[PDB]
Amino acid sequence: DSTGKCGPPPPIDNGDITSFPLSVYAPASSVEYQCQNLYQLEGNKRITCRNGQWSEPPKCLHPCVISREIMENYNIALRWTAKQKLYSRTGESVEFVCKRGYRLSSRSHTLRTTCWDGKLEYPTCAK
Amino acid sequence: SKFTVKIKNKDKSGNWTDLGDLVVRKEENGIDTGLNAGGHSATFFSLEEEVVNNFVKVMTEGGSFKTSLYYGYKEEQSVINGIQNKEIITKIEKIDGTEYITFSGDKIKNSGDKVAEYAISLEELKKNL
Amino acid sequence: DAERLKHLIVTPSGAGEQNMIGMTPTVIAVHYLDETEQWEKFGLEKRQGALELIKKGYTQQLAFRQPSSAFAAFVKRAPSTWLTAYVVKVFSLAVNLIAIDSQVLCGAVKWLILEKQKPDGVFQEDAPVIHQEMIGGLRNNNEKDMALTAFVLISLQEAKDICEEQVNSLPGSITKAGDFLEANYMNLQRSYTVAIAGYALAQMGRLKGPLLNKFLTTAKDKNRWEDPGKQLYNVEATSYALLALLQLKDFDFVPPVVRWLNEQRYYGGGYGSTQATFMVFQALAQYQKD
């Protein structure tokens, strides 16, 4: 669309470019993005430099960190594993149990939750 | 009571890749299985008491049984809420000279009709019955 | 010093790990002598010979650089998070002594960020080293996440100046790791962990208040950071702790620490010496620079 050269590619949170950054990019030149370990790239991984501007860069969809602190606070615990920390990726499901002695105060379906961009809906238990 | 069996699955390219481990728990109203694949740690599928014997047979030879509720891995539609009365049809396949229990689950969300397939060693399924 | 160090100039040989074990003493030997201006008590004819061994080491190590810019004992082996962090650690010091390809360094840096850093800033080892002796005090299972995150974080910070321009993600990664160390620091029990994460946080200017108090009140007799076990681990721990004090610019605490390390009569070299050898000369060189 122009002979417009682009500057270095736009930065993205919890990710970076698969190449080494130049200061000047020729038109139709394109870079590729890679998100950090359990971050899901949402959008195009490849951005072209057309009309002296970069294409819309992607987002790195946040994973969910399930710490034992959180689980102890909601009086819950992981049903299927002994693990005290779990790094669920966006889209990965997680099933808890009410820690021995406590009963479920939240809705019944809330014992199984799915990770969505760093937000996992933890259930509540009380006694 | 309870046992754990290592599980593999067909990825994007169709190659058999290591998924994680499958926990098979015997409860009071049947058998509830759980999937441990990295950060994923929830129910894979559940059974009734009346399927227990049929399940054991099918998981060690090949055949089909009805699951009360089926979820599967994050790829499938059934993962978030679950699909009732789903059938698990199994076959004995050989991966690099080693015999496994191959089974089809549910369709890969939005796609051109492609189901996800997993494989569990026939040896370990016989060992833990 | 210097007359003793003759054994530290070693010809690097072996695979991905064994080449590094052998490269390490030669590199920190040349680095220490350079800052301490102790080439008078050594000579000048060997400097060019020792730089050839560093060039030899760098070149030999490059055969173990994988397409993923990561390092492992062998090209067909799964890449070690530790060894890649260590290759970055050594090469960061060597950039001033010999010609290191910046991409080789920043490629390994980027790999640690995009592949081996967890969402809470933790750095995870998925393919442990074969030669566990070279990892030093990290061998202890207790508080591994804290110790490793601090080790890898140190490597990222050492490389920061050269790779700031090439790795846009680098400061974001340093912060994420820092946040983890800053969070779980007050619950630390091992002197080694307090020392290593002390230096990592000090580099970020995050070893302050209660965390700073902890770091300092962990030192036995206000001169050493030690745990019961191998003495090598205690030398390595007090070296990270000295490096941390120098970062804080606490020159009122530093002299007893320096005396304790010189008292230890540790001149490096040997089996399992890799960390203690590198750390004690990095720390003592940095001390005389300041």
Numbering used by the authors:
A (entry chain D): 1104 to 1230
B (entry chain G): 42 to 170
C (entry chain A): 996 to 1285
Lines from the paper:
The alternative pathway (AP) is activated by C3b, which randomly and covalently attaches to primary amine and hydroxyl groups on a target surface via a thioester group located in the thioester-containing domain (TED). The main AP regulator is factor H (FH). Bacteria, yeasts and even parasites utilize FH for protection against C. Typically, microbes bind FH to their surfaces to prevent C activation. Borrelia are able to recruit host FH and another host C regulator, C4b binding protein.
In our tripartite structure, OspE binds simultaneously to C3d and FH20. In our structure one asymmetric unit contains three closely packed heterotrimers with a water content of 48.8%. From density it can be seen that chain H is clearly present, presumably at low occupancy and/or disordered. For PDB-deposition the H-chain was replaced with a short alanine polypeptide chain allowing the assignment of H-chain sequence to the structure deposition. The contact surface area between FH and C3dg is 830 Å2 and there are 14 hydrogen bonds in the C:F interface of the C:F:I trimer. FH binds to the side of the C3dg α/α barrel through helices α4 (residues 104–118) and α7 (residues 170–189). The contact area between FH and OspE in the C:F:I trimer is 674 Å2 and contains 13 hydrogen bonds. On FH, the key amino acids R1182, E1195 and R1215 mediate binding to OspE loops β2, β3, and β4 and the interface between loops β5 and β6. Our structural data suggest that the C-terminus of FH has a dual function: it can bind to surfaces and C3b simultaneously and facilitate down-regulation of C.
